[PDB]
Amino acid sequence: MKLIWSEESWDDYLYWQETDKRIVKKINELIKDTRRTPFEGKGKPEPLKHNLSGFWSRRITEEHRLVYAVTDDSLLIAACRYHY
Amino acid sequence: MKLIWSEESWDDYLYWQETDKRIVKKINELIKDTRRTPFEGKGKPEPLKHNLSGFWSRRITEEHRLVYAVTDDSLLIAACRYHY
Amino acid sequence: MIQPQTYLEVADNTGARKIMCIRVLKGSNAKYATVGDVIVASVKEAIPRGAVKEGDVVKAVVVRTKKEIKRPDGSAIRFDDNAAVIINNQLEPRGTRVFGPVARELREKGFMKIVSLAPEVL
Amino acid sequence: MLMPRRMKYRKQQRGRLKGATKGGDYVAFGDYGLVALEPAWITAQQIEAARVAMVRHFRRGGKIFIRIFPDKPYTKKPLEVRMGKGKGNVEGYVAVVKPGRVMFEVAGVTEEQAMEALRIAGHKLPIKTKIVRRDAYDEA
Amino acid sequence: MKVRASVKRICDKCKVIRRHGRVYVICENPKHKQRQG
RNA sequence: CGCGGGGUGGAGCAGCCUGGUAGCUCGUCGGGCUCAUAACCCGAAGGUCGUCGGUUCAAAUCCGGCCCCCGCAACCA
RNA sequence: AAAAUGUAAAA
RNA sequence: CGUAACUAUAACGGUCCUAAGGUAGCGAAAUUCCUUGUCGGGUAAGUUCCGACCUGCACGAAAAGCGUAACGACCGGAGCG
RNA sequence: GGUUUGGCACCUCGAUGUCGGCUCGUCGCAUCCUGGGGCUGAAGAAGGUCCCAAGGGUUGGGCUGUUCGCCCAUUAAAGCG
Ligand SMILES: [Mg+2]
Ligand SMILES: [Mg+2]
Ligand SMILES: [Mg+2]
Ligand SMILES: [Mg+2]
Ligand SMILES: [Mg+2]
Ligand SMILES: [Mg+2]
Ligand SMILES: [Mg+2]
Ligand SMILES: [Mg+2]
Ligand SMILES: [Mg+2]
Ligand SMILES: [Mg+2]
Ligand SMILES: [Mg+2]
Ligand SMILES: [Mg+2]
Ligand SMILES: [Mg+2]
Ligand SMILES: [Mg+2]
Ligand SMILES: [Mg+2]
Ligand SMILES: [Mg+2]
Ligand SMILES: [Mg+2]
């Protein structure tokens, strides 16, 4: 299962090695719970509407929430915070 | 050029991130040195052949290395530790 | 009496030597062009370094004609060639000097700089 | 679109439309109906245009009853070809309508609306129309 | 809408004056002026 | 559009004429030979037969309607 | 008889 | 049908068929349909013309192939007088 | 509407010369300018859209047999039948 990272969906985790790795812990933990549960369990993994049609958002804290998008074996990463 | 890892890569990367930060930062350092302009850059680019062929190799710290693939946007990290 | 296809001797140092009358800029169907009328044109042969290169589409004022000009006072003036003086869109001479006499029709037509510059005016 | 899912034959003659109406001369379904004043072949797409037109108007509203069904194949020869060498290939389908046939019926919407919704549909149509209520339509 | 073959009423302040044999449609605002031509 | 030819495993071709299961080469897969990759050797799995209907007891096969590929023909004024 | 090539880090 | 560092393209490969699959050299040509192909050049402006490129509908070697000084009441494109 | 491509095959095959150009025009209006006018998301200058109205106008070149187009330089406009 290959992992996807958009343009903006990269600099995030990347700047997390300069400002508290706390949030990093989530990324990683959330990632694995998605490799065997596309959108089940951790962070009450749910889908999305309009803008994010077909995007499932997993809870990191309450604010941030990395939205994945499994497909023919391939977990995608879009935004760990704000939006696109 | 979106970033893409995979099984042996993310796991290869997590170990680096959770076993030594000297090479973690060195690794993603090149990833940014590539992500933009592949091939030419740091480390010591060099087109690979045979086992890899379509894969490229960036000299890292001698023994260790990092293999990837370039394709009109969308990079592809394949490996983090071990020679070739 | 200049008309399209006519060759005009350029009377100035805009670098050009000879231009071909592309069109007479009077009415919407002006037949000929004479002393004082403006014309569009092609540079047919010019000098080496020069403000103007051949193949350039320029604008100029007719200053000399082989067809006598009739004066309101019953006199007539005729020159040995048909010369013009390249000017820019504001109708100002693109050159810094002007050679050979010019017709005073040039003044009332409103081309002072050329007249002052002209070495003689008949 | 709207066309028979299957047919005994693929091409069928033209035949003339002679007055009367034979059927569907009374409402029987909704509260308001639209009837035909003059005969014609209504195209599978004049209908669908009227239908859509209706709902387009009263969105999320009542229920529309399409009382007619284009089951007759409309033939047409290739552009610029001479007469003969067979019958044209089928170009589409139509429904024979005669003066008196009720084409559409709406129900579950304010009169004021049904009047409009039906009125609009009459415009997407090749013949003159007249709207109706539900009075003496008691053959049932 | 100055001219057409379907002059109707638009706003509640639109009159259907009929002058010079033509069926005009004068209204408070110009954009509604008409004339069945 | 008018004629005639043809869409069959991933590729490229048989099978349709002689209706009663599908073949061939390459590839793919598992195992050897090797220091290793080829090549070479062993043994595998994989085909809705373009599609929607028909004839038959049974349709890749036979009849039909569309759908793309290929090839011919489109003349005299 | 015939049988090819070569995994990229020089202290 | 497939294949080389983005893309492209495919020196390489696979397969089917043949009696054998078009070499050199030419190539939008007295041949190029699409077509006024696309880049140059010439012109103020060029469906022609000249130089190039080749996806040559539909060149190609003695019904010759590609060239060639000289010659031409031959057909084309340009200037000057 | 009857300017296109066609359908039909009615006069014309004891012949109705069939593209383009030139010369000469004349007519229509569904108006390209110019003249009147209504709206406008019309401030003004400039436009847009519809209405009235041919009286008169409606350029010169490059390319091609072209009509047509495209291009150059203009124009009040470079109208369509
Ligand atoms: Mg590639
Ligand atoms: Mg030059
Ligand atoms: Mg093996
Ligand atoms: Mg070595
Ligand atoms: Mg080959
Ligand atoms: Mg050419
Ligand atoms: Mg041609
Ligand atoms: Mg010439
Ligand atoms: Mg010529
Ligand atoms: Mg030759
Ligand atoms: Mg006719
Ligand atoms: Mg006859
Ligand atoms: Mg007859
Ligand atoms: Mg005849
Ligand atoms: Mg006779
Ligand atoms: Mg012709
Ligand atoms: Mg009018």
Residue B39, domain CATH: 3.30.2310.20
Give the whole-angstrom CA distance, residue D72 versus residue C72. 90
**B7:A1 CB<8 A:** yes
Q: Is B57 helix (H, G, I), strand (E, B) or coil?
A: strand
Structure tokens at B14: 């997590």
Structure tokens at A50: 């309009």
Residues in CB range of D136: below 8 A, 6 or more apart:
D26
Ligand 11 centroid, distance to D14 Cα (angstroms): 27
Angle between helix axes B7-17 and B21-34 (nearest 10 degrees) is 130
The count of structural domains within chain D is 1
A9–chain B nearest CA distance, Å: 9
Give the whole-angstrom CA distance, residue D111 versus residue D109. 6
Give the whole-angstrom CA distance, residue B49 versus residue B46. 10
Residue among A47, A41, A83 nearest A68 (CA)? A47
Type of residue found at D94: V
Residues in CB range of A40: below 8 A, 6 or more apart:
A33
Q: Is C105 helix (H, G, I), strand (E, B) or coil?
A: helix
Residue E23 CA: distances (Å) to CA of E4, E17, E18, E20: 11, 7, 4, 8
Residue D98 lies in a domain: yes
Resolution in A: 3.3
Extended beta strands in chain B, E state = 3-4, 56-59, 65-68, 77-78
Residue among C11, C8, C14, C18 nearest C120 (CA)? C11
Do D23 and D101 form a contact (C-beta atoms < 8 A)? yes
Give the whole-angstrom CA distance, residue C117 versus residue A45. 88
Chains D and C touch (3+ CB pairs under 8 A): no
Give the whole-angstrom CA distance, residue D69 versus residue D48. 11
Q: What string of H, E and C letters represents the secondary structure of chain E?
A: CCCECCCCCCCCCECCCCECCECCCCECCHHHCCCEC
The count of structural domains within chain B is 1
Q: Is B11 helix (H, G, I), strand (E, B) or coil?
A: helix
Type of residue found at C10: V
Which one of A5, A12, A21 makes the best mutation probe of the B interface by having the most chain B beta carbons within 10 Å? A5
- What's the sign of the alpha-carbon dihedral B50, B55, B60, B63? negative
Give the whole-angstrom CA distance, residue C8 versus residue B49. 71
Structure tokens at D86: 């067979």
Residue among B48, B30, B49, B50 nearest B40 (CA)? B30
- For residue D39, the enclosing domain spans 29-137
Give the whole-angstrom CA distance, residue A66 versus residue E6. 59
Give the whole-angstrom CA distance, residue B22 versus residue B14. 13
Instruction: Report, in angstroms and rounded to the nearest whole number, the Rg of chain A calculated over CA atoms.
Output: 12
With beta carbons under 8 A apart, name residues in chain B contacting A1.
Answer: 6-7
Give the whole-angstrom CA distance, residue C18 versus residue C15. 10
- For residue B41, the enclosing domain spans 1-84
Structure tokens at B10: 């993310």
What number of CA atoms fall less than 13 Å from residue B26's CA on the CB side? 16
For B3: left if phi > 0, alpha if psi spans -120 to 50, otherwise beta; the answer is beta
Residue among D42, D48, D39, D44 nearest D100 (CA)? D39
Q: Is C37 helix (H, G, I), strand (E, B) or coil?
A: coil
